[model samples]
Target: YDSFYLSHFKYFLGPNPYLNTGALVFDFSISAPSKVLPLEDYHQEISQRFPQLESYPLTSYGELFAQTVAEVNQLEMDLHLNLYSIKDERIAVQSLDYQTSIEVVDLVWDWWEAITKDQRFNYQFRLKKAQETFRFSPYGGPSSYALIESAYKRKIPTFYLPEERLTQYGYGKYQIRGVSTTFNSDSHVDLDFTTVKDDCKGFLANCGFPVPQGYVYSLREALNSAEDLYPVVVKPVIHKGIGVTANINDKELEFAYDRAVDASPNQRQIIVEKYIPGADFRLLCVGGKFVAALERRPSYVIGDGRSTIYDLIEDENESPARQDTPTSALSPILIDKSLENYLEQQGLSLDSILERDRLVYLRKVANISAGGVSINVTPTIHPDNIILAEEIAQYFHIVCFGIDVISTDLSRSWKEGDFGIIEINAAPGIFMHLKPAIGDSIDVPGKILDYLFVSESTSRMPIITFNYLPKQTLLEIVNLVLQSHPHWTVGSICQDGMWINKSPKPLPKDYNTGVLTLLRHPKLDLLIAEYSQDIFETEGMLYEGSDLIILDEPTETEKILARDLRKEGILITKQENQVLIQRAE
Candidate 1:
């Protein structure tokens, strides 16, 4: 009885009998028949078919079958045995010499023991089918798979998927019929127009899209033509993009223009466009399909019955996602004079709205940076939304794109509906899709790989570059510098201008003939100035004279001065306590 129990236990715990080529073929494809059965039934039938081994009383056929089925299910379902291949040599030795090679059986037992101990192993898999192929090993961990799915589900605009996992799993060969592929780093697209010809607004207009009505002209022309371009967005046509000063009226237009001309030498024209009021949505297209969609509400949350809108905003600001980084979207909500004006526009105030039961969304710009939340609209989006995305992608000649659209109603079809395209992003962030603690994963990167590598053999491989900065060394240097000069206060220095620590005593109304002596010290050779125009007018002294101006505060003025001074062939540098300012003198 002892020997029988030991033999059956050894059979159960020994090297897998299916390791032999003959046994593998029999177990996988044959040795079971005579009845229609579920997977569990078939598993048992196979164990019972080998009745000679089960004849011993300790080796109950039912118990043996149950154990074998569990092992097979674990290998197949949990560890993705479908993705891996067993070496023929390892299998042959284990099966033919099972009794003699105690070490091999011990190793297998140990592996099984370790697997059962951890839940993380339950999410793992092996892609044995493509083990010997060119595309093997691309399949990384399940996290990579989840990230790709999240991107697709969320329709995150830009994302990078690990290619290794897809190819290895034999999923990389799938592709979308017509779409192309591109690579992304960091996921967010930087949209800025430097040339008049690359006019983003014009591009949309030429593509039969609506743009604000205005021409390139003076601020006076814009102000005079305010009725025609009422409630317009005025910004520099060249540098206007995300985070650029946008959405303004004639008065605001003039202020923005003054700032632009003061800062820029390109002599670029300012753009004034009609402002439209509506809800905004960022639509992401992956593999020619609308994988994810996010409705943006200009960041605002209503009162929880007790808190003020101000306090509610403060609480929202403390959310983990908001605290992670500085975003233009999450700029502080001010309870300033403008609040009354804004409330008047909404026909409500802090006292009028229900704080506890109702939520209010302020700000017309549905930018994610301005306290806006991205609400997922994946399962509910209309089919026409997908078509609109496809059309927009085709129009822009972009394979991966994020289209920003505004509409009063989202339930209605976007195409053949009252909607307008505000901007098109060449690269969109896939982070929301990959790490959506708020919503579902779009799996966009996986869809992209399926389309790029699996479906289309002709797609071009992306150009990849890796950059590493010695951040540790840089930080150490910064730390050392800060320690050495612990008491020193650093400020911006203006080049080729009069320098003063703070706003100097008001210049006397009739004080004209005084030669301004810019004091110099050996240790403080660099002069600091608070921006004041009266003391620093050099145009009267020389055609282009600079009396050793050192800008301690290198603000936007530094760039302007750098350009204008270079034009006059002036050489500027800092050496210890002296600014060696020289020209063709």
Candidate 2:
């Protein structure tokens, strides 16, 4: 809003990520009951009531939750419901967090009004009771909560895999696997060859960038030139920085060499490079542009006149934001052997007390994973430096690349001081940017989703399935679908088996792996899954629904499922050798 913030071009001002991000949703059928099922009868009568009742399902949490989720989607509220009975152990997903819990209650109430549509339920409840009943809904992971809340406000849908899987599809077409993703791509280089240390260095050198001078060693010739490499910077060739022990003096060369050899794929093969010393700044480039900048300050603590080193660390851990949860952007620093070693290297111990306002660093490595913290410095990074980082991302054709620069002063030109590329990372972490220590929270996830999707339909596809039936009928229905959609890449799942393009695929041994595998297929075009109402309810649909439904002799479960899909899909119902095609569309 002011000139200071406006000076930085890092804040996204392009198309909304929600506009491009499209979510493909999955809704589960039924499960036992959650801890909040006070009316499990009305406490007991509804107990055995849900057994086969999953088909002729009566009013229960699972039924209400599913109906609410479906109703929300139908009303264009821009939400996808993935729900099941946790108490019952069915395929279910719901959001119950600081924000979503109250929303869940409203959804149930909305469904309550509609449940009386056809005199469907004998159960009735005041809105207050509904909220109390559904409060046991669990909160999703951090990223899921934030992204979904954003999407709902912007009217973008959020999706999940067939199983209550928040793992893969939590970000719509985007994914967060440990901290690796394809936020960008290119065709001008050899990807793996450029990933290794030597290759990457050479690649950088060829790109006309300042790369730390290093020798790639794999053989006797590598050691022949070892006389040129000296005191330190002994790095193993395979993984980046894992086995690297830098700053070793000539006397410790043999010891460092031993450590390097332990990790080198080829015995004694390691890269000895010119070490660069300065503040480690990580530049996050997304969509071929700079998004966030983090200056990694090594694991350290401040000394107050009264606190011990251990006590200082304890105080730092006391920050309410610090946690070890999966979605925690900042990690709590821990006391370990490496830390103890670093203390000895610095001529101090955990019990040492220092004067007030003194900063004590614990380790040389500034990686957050190694107990370091980062402060946002995007606003301070020199413009030339931003251009330099972008040029580097383009050089390696990395859309989501991390440019690690060691520079004394980031507010000045990189070439003005002893700044050089420390490393270029392919799968870099944006968590630091998302939740920086001292700067604004950047929209890294939004940028990723924006880059991935073009429109709401971009990530969606046509799906088809039969109303519930026996395994024999399911197989028959799948074969029928196979003949109809021969030109499309089709995936199907049911008790009969799993099919990819009408061919059998290796079914992973998991509760919903069979359907999940198909949903995750990169080029999935069409899905023709068959379901038995009971399995469908508990296991859940990999897809939200189908374009077409071929009804067979309907089980009670099948009939209920058909009711949910009635408005949007064509239904061809059959019984006793008689067939009727039905639809209002």
Candidate 3:
């Protein structure tokens, strides 16, 4: 069997193969569509290859494979693998992303190959490799994925920048390049100041933002600072809660200081701030506006009285939410020295049998990376709290970021209780807001798009295509359009090849590929691409919808293609010359 993978880049602008995104097509004679097995047989074969499928709650093989791979690898996008048979020679596995689709097909092929040989093939090894390799890959993490998914949902013309871990939303001058939560709109000055914890905290304090009173000090002076600010927080100046210890007493000051040094070995100083007693809430702000709030709880377990702390931890890890993967909403709680130390501070051990219903926190910091749980409190957040977050966001000139606030009660105003802004996350994680463990999921990513693209029309520029048109007529139309919109940066793919602003370039033999390239060009304000009946049948509409489609001497299939390719709400009409232009009625 000779089978190759076709990625989203190849199907980038297309709407078909399946999900608007991409699909994995495989060609093999043995596993051909005509020789397909029953759904029950498919499940049996998958379970046999990956015994873990038996433990999964899903019943269908497609569901089992997709869910298992997603959970195991902590993939940001969920795979809905709908098996589509193109012909006796090709089977397409459709998914939201072609990369994940390839992984699914790999497993399927392995299982197929194994059954043909009557030899067992272990699936865990491949899955484990995916976990190690794909978790941190581009479009694999939640933050980057949020922007990508939102663009698709909004019907915005978006494309991934090649080799760069960046995604461009919109086209040309209106385009915004985003990596994680940070976007092209973010100011370098703001990001730099936000990155340095001490500077950010000092700035907030100067602005009377109710930030905690803290000082950056060397390891030797940390104990002295603790003596004065006992029950304080010790943390690295530039780390993500790696060496952070909250509510540290004099007794734990030394250990906490050592941990801080360990985490920031190259750094000369760490921050020792006054501990603000309250639940940790992360306020996500987009374009100087409060979008959502997430109250995060550090990894913890409630006692059952009969079970030991270790057993309790084990049981909590079994929850469907906890998975040991990068993009998983919640991390599986791990037993470590710091956890054991925290246990000792509470006069307990892993072996201690806790009282029924008593909760014991395993980590000091409420970082989701440390197996924390987040509850979306967007709808419940007090108006004053939203105002507070918005003020900070505007002051910092942050495009999209998170403000860490410690508050006793979110329903109440921050001024009424012990509340403090602890940190500023320049690139905040959006997964918690999207997939909160305790509260209804918020479409925060979509909010980000709203903020980024202030004007709805800016997110997508007009794309006009002249398909099945005479060469002379096509050039005439192009020249007329170019002269009419002289300011527009027009890009075109015609018989002569691709042209950007009238400059000729080599053409990709595949018209679909050419259109995909032109769509992402930074200088393009509008695109004129060519489409053929053959291309339409094989690739569907390359772009989701075109602003205008001009067809000459249209056939029945050509009319159908035009109907499918035209933007929603646009009316199509024809003339004697068989020229067509669609617009909103």
Candidate 4:
């Protein structure tokens, strides 16, 4: 999650060219100290909890960080914190609020023990008001962070759920959900869940949009109905794609039934569809518009006058983009029995060499994962094709749609009625659009966010807070903001739950994310909070740095912040009975 924000921070901050990754731009302020925020007592509590790290000198921030990583890893927990840096002392604010687990804080306190020994590992969003409900991917699905960037770019707020990691078999509520358009998606289908082919086909057919007519059947019924669907596909209902055989002849039905049964034995049914012939295209629709369209061309090679088919394949596999990287969009093609079988289907072999410009397809499915290329078809697809896609998009509440459509030939139109909707994916991968093998890149994720936010309202709010101030100080600051601030709303989150200007009431503490609770109001204008030292060990201040900070007694870290704060604006701290306002020379 830290990396999620940091990477985009680089985009907005314009990564420091000399550094590997860092946004040179810092759109935040620091608070000088009036009263020191103390922690020596908590240091004792931490010492009792974990005695081993107590004696270690703040053995270097980097090495200490490694120890935390190594210790967490040693326990075999899937835990990690990445890409945080020291933002010039005092408060090194990234994104995590440290509202994780008690043990997570236990480890952090150990670092504090070392920080007291060194005060080093220094470094460390916005949306102080209840704002737009956007989406995020917890398991950090491919390009999940891109949406966060888009949200930031559009000035929206997000709540990062802790269930952001991919575990054995779990929920991904944050993975593909979107919002605010009269669509309540109760928001659960297994973000990575599979949809039955017939379910979508039937839905589309009823909607008067185009979809292939398919029938569901028992395994036995499918085999017997062979004559009816001679050139049909037999798919396992439970594992729909596990045993799919396309362009099936009557002879292939027996094997197709057996293969289909083996794929999902527990399921009681299977789907049989008349095989439709044409190139496969995936049209991704986000926000009621087609953002990306690509043709999955079967893995093939255009022949040179003299080179063998094998030679041409070997060269293509060596391409930089074709490297076998787990994260790469295009997978490298490998010569296997499947490839050989596919080649044999076309009366071709690896050793065969044809005249120049002859195209030899070695596979049936043009899956990028199966070593096929994605040819961007957005520029060439017919206008009607896009309209048809949008029509299909209206039938569901999906935010991101990967629609597999077999074209009505190269040129298309609903009037011709040549396109057949093959499948609709709720969570579609957009990396292909980001880095197509041969075409301009599209920011599909960005567009999806734009669709979610569509508003000009900001997620950021002005925040002012005080530290080491007695309970009386919060009252004083609230009074000050009321008289001096022109905004409609003014509030404070602190040792005293939620205290606002107009409706003067005390909201109970969420304890964990108490500050966040205060910021939930739709129209929060000025925020003034008191940083009670009790939370320094258990949690991070819900708010990061304030626009202006009033300190009574300065903490060591706050002192450094005071310097940075004065550099940009006036930093005031109460000294004796006077408010000490410091200004930069």
| Leading candidate by lDDT | 3
TM-score of 2: 0.58
Candidates 2 and 4 compared: the better one by lDDT is 2
- TM-score-superior candidate, 2 or 4: 4
Q: Rank the candidates by TM-score, best first.
A: 3, 4, 2, 1
- In order of listing, the candidates' clash counts read 57, 12, 1, 17
lDDT of 1 by residue, 309-379 (tens): 66666677676566322212234454543343445445666555345768675554544544456667667
lDDT of 3 by residue, 1-585 (tens): 322222223332345433343444444343344444454555566576457556756444345434433333333335223334344444444444556546655655565555445546676676665544555457666667667667776877666665565777876557788787888778899888887876777788888789777655655577777676348888886665576777875568888888788877887478887777888899988888888898988888888789898998888888888876565677888777778877876789999998889999987666576577878878888999999988888876667778888888898888885888877898788877887878788887888888788765667677776556545555676688779987777777765567676667787776666776776666777877666666665665556666677666556555554554534534344657554445544
Question: Which lDDT tens digits does candidate 2 get at residues 1-585?
Answer: 110010110111111111112221233332323323343333133233333333444455545444343333222222343322222312123332323433443444333333323324433343334333333323233334444454444433334432433434322233222213442233335345446766777767897788877664443433433457443477676654455566664445565566677766565656676666678899888767888888988778888789789988888888875665334556688777667766775678999997899999877676565457778988998998999988877655554678888888788887785688877777676667877666788887677656545345444465567764345654565667668866556676666577665467766654356655666665677666666665554444444445578777877667654543524667788899998877737
Best by TM-score: 3
Query: Arrange candidates by lDDT, highest first: which order?
Result: 3, 2, 4, 1
Candidate 4 lDDT by residue in tens digits, 1-585: 111011212121111211122112222221222221343433444345446557756533333433332333212212222333334321122222222222332345344444444544321211111011111214233455444444545434444323322211101111223332112242355323326555556667888877776564555677555565347777776642455667675457766777677766776387777777788888988866788898888788988789888988888888777844333567788777668766765678989886899988877776676578887878887888888888877665667777888874646675585668787777777767766767877887567656654553323466565656454666676777778875657766666555667455655544434455455544567666665445432343443244576777756544433422322456788767888776534
Model 1 Cα shift for residue 201 (angstroms): 4.0
The C-alpha TM-scores of every prediction are 0.39, 0.58, 0.78, 0.62
Worst 10 residues of 3 by lDDT: 2-11
lDDT comparison, 1 vs 2, better candidate: 2
Ten-residue stretch with the least lDDT total in model 4: 125-134
The candidate, 2 or 3, that scores higher on lDDT is 3
Better of 3 and 4 by TM-score: 3
Clashes of 3: 1
**C-alpha lDDT score of every prediction, in listed order:** 0.40, 0.56, 0.68, 0.54
